[PDB]
Amino acid sequence: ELDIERVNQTLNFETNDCKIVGSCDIFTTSRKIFAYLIAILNASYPDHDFSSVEPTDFVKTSLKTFISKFENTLYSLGRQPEEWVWEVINSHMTLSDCVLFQYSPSNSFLEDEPGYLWNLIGFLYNRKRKRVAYLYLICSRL
Amino acid sequence: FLKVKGLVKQHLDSFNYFVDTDLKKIIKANQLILSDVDPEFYLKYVDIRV
Amino acid sequence: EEALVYSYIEASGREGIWSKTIKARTNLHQHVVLKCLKSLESQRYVKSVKSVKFPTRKIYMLYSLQPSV
DSSP, X not given: OHHHHHHHHHSEXXXXXXXXXXXOOEEOOOOTTHHHXXXXXXXXXXXSOSSSOXXXXXXXXXXXXXXHHHHHHHHTTTOOOOTHHHHHHHHTTOGGGOEEEOBOOSSOTTTTSTTXXXXXXXXXXXXXXXXXXXXXXXXXXX | OTTTSOSSHHHHHHHHHIIIIITHHHHXXXXXXXXXXXXXXXXXXOOOOO | OTTXXXXXXXXXXXXXXXXXXXXXXXXXXXXXXXXXXXXXXXXXXXXXXXXXXXXXXXXEEETTOOOOO
């Protein structure tokens, strides 16, 4: 939509000698969910298989702890993070009563990408609406 | 001279040229939208008016 | 378009090819070559083997059955 386009215009930028490309998306298409996210990873990056690493590191952390450093890195990149974003992703998904996941293994699949610096990948599973957002931030260097 | 022209004609005639001639010569310079996935779903702009 | 990717497998010849190294010489449409290899998997020519090298990348090779260690 338009608001999703705005919050994606937020998360794609480049400062002096760094280039961050990430976005959020919401779409409806813990034993059964292990395959439900690797398809999102396959469609997100159609050059790496994600059926390989099945017992991965999904750090089932608090979403408040996640959005804390998700806001701290936007302070840390000179962005002054705009608060309405966190209502907009609420307004499509009912951010309060939902659980968060995070693909952060030992060695992620972007370490071989040249110019890689760091990532921040957020999964937000919903139960009543089945609306999983794939919030991802990839900081590169050019 | 100044009756039918005026003194702000260098602003007025240029903007009248843009909304009556140069809007067409921008639409015609890039008329068509080509979808790379399924190269049949095209999209072209016939004309423009404000 | 399906014949130049055959020679690029033959450019690899023995090990295989990764799908984003296709764009090093082709740089064609990223989705046309995305669905071409799915039908080429259905063509029963190529197969999706796994990397002897650094893993977690789509390695494709014709029916040679020839990996390394």
